[PDB]
């Protein structure tokens, strides 16, 4: 349902996820903050199951954002993995991994884990 | 394999996992650094499948360490989840979660995730 996924989404933290679902299974877009200034926007790319099951299952998908744009660089990247669930209260339920570039001594603590729920209306 | 689990184990980072497997599925022990000084020793408690399949499958288990002893307190706790695999080269394969006590604002970044492999001989 690229017609379901394409559009603007918001998570519980106020961040805005703007995405377009290609018919080929590609995800393209931008990830930004509430203010929505050019300095807080970052490119995102991902993939999604363009032919989900018709048994009531969700649509699996994932995307990545490297935290570097033309103004800031946090030397880290986050990946969200989850599924899109359409209907009256459409949403994307995800769990994410935020890996930061670290030295060998600190690699043990390079990755954070969390979860985000995205909806079509601000929370 | 209560006999299999009970004993001293070492992970890739050098830490020492000293555990005893009770007959009713209890795991009790201490977690310390390679040096073994008292100030780096922490209590651990967990559970394990006391009646695993005897067809070559691993023994599921998990344990928790709250990073506070009589000498220090890092306001955090780690849980290891995984399975014990017996044999010539016994090993305990795990994935772990480290949560730090945070304010409501920093909660999104409270949890780190990683993996440890424990063996009977120092790495």
């Amino acid at each position: 349902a690229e017609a379901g996924i394409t559009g603007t989404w918001y998570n519980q933290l106020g961040s805005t996820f703007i995405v377009t679902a290609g018919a080929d299974g590609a995800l393209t877009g931008t990830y930004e903050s509430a203010v929505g200034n050019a300095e807080s926007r970052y490119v995102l790319t991902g993939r999604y199951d363009s032919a989900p099951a018709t048994d009531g299952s969700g649509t699996a998908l994932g995307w990545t954002v490297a935290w570097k744009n033309n103004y800031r660089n946090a030397h880290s990247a986050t990946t969200w993995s989850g599924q899109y669930v359409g209907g009256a209260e459409a949403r994307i339920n995800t769990q994410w991994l935020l890996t930061s570039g670290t030295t060998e001594a600190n690699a043990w603590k390079s990755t954070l884990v969390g979860h985000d729920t995205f909806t079509k209306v601000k929370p | 394999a209560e006999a299999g689990i009970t004993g001293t184990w070492y992970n890739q980072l050098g830490s020492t996992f000293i555990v005893t497997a009770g007959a009713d599925g209890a795991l009790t022990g201490t977690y310390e650094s390679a040096v073994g000084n008292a100030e780096s020793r922490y209590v651990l408690t967990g559970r394990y499948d006391s009646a695993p399949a005897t067809d070559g499958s691993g023994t599921a288990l998990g344990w928790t360490v709250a990073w506070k002893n009589n000498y220090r307190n890092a306001h955090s706790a780690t849980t290891w989840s995984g399975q014990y695999v017996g044999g010539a080269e016994a090993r305990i394969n795990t994935q772990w979660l480290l949560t730090s006590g945070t304010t409501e604002a920093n909660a999104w970044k409270s949890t780190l995730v990683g993996h440890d492999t424990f063996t009977k001989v120092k790495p």
Binding site: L13, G14, S15, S33, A34, V35, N37, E39, S40, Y42, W67, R72, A74, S76, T78, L98 | A105, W108, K109
Partner: peptide
């Protein structure tokens, strides 16, 4: 918040 993921639109 000092990381872009939590909406960091300030200067730390």
């Amino acid at each position: 918040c000092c990381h872009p993921q939590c909406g960091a639109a300030y200067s730390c």
